[PDB]
Design a protein around this ligand. Sequence first.
Ligand SMILES: [K+]
Ligand SMILES: [K+]
Ligand SMILES: [K+]
Ligand SMILES: [K+]
Ligand SMILES: [K+]
Ligand SMILES: [K+]
Ligand SMILES: [K+]
Ligand SMILES: [K+]
Ligand SMILES: [Mg+2]
Ligand SMILES: [Mg+2]
Ligand SMILES: [Mg+2]
Ligand SMILES: [Mg+2]
Ligand SMILES: [Mg+2]
Ligand SMILES: [Mg+2]
Ligand SMILES: [Mg+2]
Ligand SMILES: [Mg+2]
Ligand SMILES: [Mg+2]
Ligand SMILES: [Mg+2]
Ligand SMILES: [Mg+2]
Ligand SMILES: [Mg+2]
Ligand SMILES: [Mg+2]
Ligand SMILES: [Mg+2]
Ligand SMILES: [Mg+2]
Ligand SMILES: [Mg+2]
Ligand SMILES: [Mg+2]
Ligand SMILES: [Mg+2]
Ligand SMILES: [Mg+2]
Ligand SMILES: [Mg+2]
Ligand SMILES: [Mg+2]
Ligand SMILES: [Mg+2]
Ligand SMILES: [Mg+2]
Ligand SMILES: [Mg+2]
Ligand SMILES: [Mg+2]
Ligand SMILES: [Mg+2]
Ligand SMILES: [Mg+2]
Ligand SMILES: [Mg+2]
Lengths: 141, 61, 48, 184, 261
Amino acid sequence: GKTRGMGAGRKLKSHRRRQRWADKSYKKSHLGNEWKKPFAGSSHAKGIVLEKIGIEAKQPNSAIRKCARVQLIKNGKKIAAFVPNDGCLNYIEENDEVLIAGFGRKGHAVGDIPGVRFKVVKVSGVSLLALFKEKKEKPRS
Amino acid sequence: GGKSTGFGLIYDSVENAKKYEPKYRLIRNGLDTKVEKSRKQMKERKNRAKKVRGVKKTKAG
Amino acid sequence: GSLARAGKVRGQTPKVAKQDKKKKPRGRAHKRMQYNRRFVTRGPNSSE
Amino acid sequence: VHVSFYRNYGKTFKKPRRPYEKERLDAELKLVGEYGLRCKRELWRVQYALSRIRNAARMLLTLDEKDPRRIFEGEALLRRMNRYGLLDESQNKLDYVLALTVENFLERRLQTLVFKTGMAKSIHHARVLIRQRHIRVGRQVVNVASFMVRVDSQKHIDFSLTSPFGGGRPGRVKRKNQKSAAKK
Amino acid sequence: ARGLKKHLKRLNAPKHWMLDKLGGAFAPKPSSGPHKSRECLPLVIILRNRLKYALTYREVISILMQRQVMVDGKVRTDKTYPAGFMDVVTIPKTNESFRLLYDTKGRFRLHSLRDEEAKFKLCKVRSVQFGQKGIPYLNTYDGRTIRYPDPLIKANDTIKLDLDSNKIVDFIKFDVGNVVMVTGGRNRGRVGILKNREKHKGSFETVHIQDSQGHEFATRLGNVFTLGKGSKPWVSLPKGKGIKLSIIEEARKRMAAQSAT
RNA sequence: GUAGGAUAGUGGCCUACCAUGGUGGUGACGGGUGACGGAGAAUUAGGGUUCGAUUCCGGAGAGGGAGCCUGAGAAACGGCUACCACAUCCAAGGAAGGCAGCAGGCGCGCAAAUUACCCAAUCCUGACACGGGGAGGUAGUGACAAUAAAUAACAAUACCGGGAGUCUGGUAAUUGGAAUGAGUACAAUCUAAAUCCCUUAACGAGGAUCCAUUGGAGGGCAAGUCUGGUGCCAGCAGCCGCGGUAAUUCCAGCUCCAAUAGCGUAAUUUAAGUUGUUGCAGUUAAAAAGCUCGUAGUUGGACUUUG
Ligand SMILES: [K+]
Ligand SMILES: [K+]
Ligand SMILES: [K+]
Ligand SMILES: [K+]
Ligand SMILES: [K+]
Ligand SMILES: [K+]
Ligand SMILES: [K+]
Ligand SMILES: [K+]
Ligand SMILES: [Mg+2]
Ligand SMILES: [Mg+2]
Ligand SMILES: [Mg+2]
Ligand SMILES: [Mg+2]
Ligand SMILES: [Mg+2]
Ligand SMILES: [Mg+2]
Ligand SMILES: [Mg+2]
Ligand SMILES: [Mg+2]
Ligand SMILES: [Mg+2]
Ligand SMILES: [Mg+2]
Ligand SMILES: [Mg+2]
Ligand SMILES: [Mg+2]
Ligand SMILES: [Mg+2]
Ligand SMILES: [Mg+2]
Ligand SMILES: [Mg+2]
Ligand SMILES: [Mg+2]
Ligand SMILES: [Mg+2]
Ligand SMILES: [Mg+2]
Ligand SMILES: [Mg+2]
Ligand SMILES: [Mg+2]
Ligand SMILES: [Mg+2]
Ligand SMILES: [Mg+2]
Ligand SMILES: [Mg+2]
Ligand SMILES: [Mg+2]
Ligand SMILES: [Mg+2]
Ligand SMILES: [Mg+2]
Ligand SMILES: [Mg+2]
Ligand SMILES: [Mg+2]
């Protein structure tokens, strides 16, 4: 059982120190591997759209999830960013600056989209929500 | 509305007021004039004037 | 997969303009009617 | 360094932990409509203030009744409640502080007292009168409905001298109408 | 830092000055002088914040530059001059004369004095030792040095100094049974009778002081200042007379005052 | 350790000589830190967890090192000298450079404002009551954050309920007269001078267009088995799931719900007694070392002066 001695302060403190690593949440933050992620600990990130792609929805669903491969400007890493809402892929062109954000599960895949953990927030400095609701238009043409 | 509060000073004579009263409060009562000046211009003149030696400091435009 | 069908349904949906109506009260007044309609006088949006 | 950085400020309310509890929504809306509150924020800050008062009383009650801090701060807390009418002279004990409710604080609002003193036809009518500069507490005009009236000041609530309802000239609506009638 | 600091941030000033925190970013930096910067009251505070004669920092300079203020019988023109405990401040134009004494709450109080009583002050002896040529001398805690002192005077004693003749008129030996005032720490401003002296070799000496109402409090020897021999102080004390009342007692007086006043 | 040297002074601080010591599982030494330390900050039944670049205190640096003069005080950088790294001017022989001060620009980025006014307040400094102060203050930008608080009130009709009847209560872009600040503006006040606020002549509300928004309406979880479109497509969906021709879940209209001048989305606390000292588990769910010995560690019977 637990060590109870009044003089066992060191052992209890050292025991807990070793055992905290067994916790996945603790080890994820204190490992230092977060800085190796594409965002490198950032909430958002800008990137350049390399190409427009579709990803087959995971079973038992059946659909083509519209995504876009994006290369991050600050570190040059390539990621897949999901484009939400209906018909918003038409607002995205290749070699365009897009602001990327997490998908809501802190680096984990969301929904039936396989291996996707990012979504597109802005395109050409304009939020997709504004374009979807016809609030604004992209600055070109 | 209906009430105001302020601070007042009564001096024994105008001569005493001009000695202890700040300049800006004397201009309000009309006991002194206002000399218009630009602090930034004065600073630039100071820096230009210290690159010359002798009586030519003043003549430095 | 094919990307040519993006925006399919949204473009097919016929446009229907919103009907302009008198605005509801704001702030305290809004809570006044909300209070009379639930305590002074089936769910709130039942299809009765 | 900026001197303004040393100015203090704090929060006055906390949002509910459970946002969609049907029982809580029903109870809160009843108080909001009864006292003509603007929104749930006004009710929540009163609850926040009430929690602070009760928390102070609990700490004092946990101490020995002979503790000097218990005696000193306990009397001050009771005196503060009495001065606002929350408690009565017959309830001079910290235990009665723990029995206070939100309704007690809402009844001391200027909006509630204006309506319950006959100056206003409805609780909502009192709200408009206060914000429209028609009420005064003593000599000072008060345009805040949340003003918590004191017992010594409850009897001095009256219409402002500048208001049309307190001896002042009629408002611009009547004056313009009188002008229009004269032109005829 | 590479030398001496010339500024005092307002929040870093001594609390007993009672300076509003939003009044500015700076507080008057006490000048070097007889008293320590943390145990003094600069003339700017006295003239502007305590007596209200000056309304601004500038007006204090005008008053002092006219030679209208004297400290310990000498005119002082330094705005941040460190006036401290037992110092006598005289303003001939207003015919006023004050002595800096701590109130029972530990803050300097400008105790108005009569003309006769403003001709002397009390000083605490720091040490007595031989100077150059074997001439004995003593120095006090207010920066004063007196040569050829009475041989009976020893460290920690109190001497009555005449501001006119600048000579020691009388002195009080530091011993149990005399009335003393606390000049520092938690018990600052309290007056009582020295009841005991506990010495600890190599450490600070503790002194037990009993108030006139029987309340007993301790403190360090460095915070004690003898005021008189026996039980009667040689200087006039404020209304409190060094009697520290409990918050309950103080609240009781306030409640009674409202009923009467 | 001894004797010197040097220093404002103690000291292997340094030199000569001599001795062989010094630290370490009570973690030395080394490594990592997206590490300046503290006062403190967030959240906290209690214990606790996390944070602390930043206005107070202490330290450190002035592109990277090193050296130094002056001086009471500097190994100073809005002082000098050299090297290195960048970079300005030149009549090409030279010369002058240090914004992690204020403002501003470029770059970097998810990420941050005026190349403004003033020494009037706070205080500092000089030979000095007077000069100076991008310290500091004032205004501009400012939905970081925080506080108060509008967007209607009342009456009469019509309509609809409750306690044939009559008192009360609820609806309507109906009909009426009242109230009022947003705004605007004489003025005064405010201020160093302006500006805002406060005060106030006049003016200023009926669809009082002087138009409240942001997210939702299968469950978790407050709110529709409404109508049109789409037909495993398009999309939704934090999780469970919805969509394959009669979709409560997608795209729309209507209605309704929550918060409300705010609200949605993308490290950390709470929930977590899922890190358990308080306070968790280890027969079968993840978990007793194959067995015993054994040092450090941790833990160790009773008894001595009561009445
Ligand atoms: K633990
Ligand atoms: K130093
Ligand atoms: K030395
Ligand atoms: K040695
Ligand atoms: K010097
Ligand atoms: K100044
Ligand atoms: K000066
Ligand atoms: K427990
Ligand atoms: Mg056991
Ligand atoms: Mg410095
Ligand atoms: Mg000693
Ligand atoms: Mg030596
Ligand atoms: Mg050697
Ligand atoms: Mg740290
Ligand atoms: Mg670092
Ligand atoms: Mg810090
Ligand atoms: Mg850093
Ligand atoms: Mg900064
Ligand atoms: Mg600092
Ligand atoms: Mg330095
Ligand atoms: Mg740099
Ligand atoms: Mg240097
Ligand atoms: Mg510089
Ligand atoms: Mg410097
Ligand atoms: Mg920002
Ligand atoms: Mg509006
Ligand atoms: Mg206004
Ligand atoms: Mg819908
Ligand atoms: Mg529900
Ligand atoms: Mg349908
Ligand atoms: Mg749903
Ligand atoms: Mg867990
Ligand atoms: Mg478990
Ligand atoms: Mg098994
Ligand atoms: Mg098992
Ligand atoms: Mg035993």
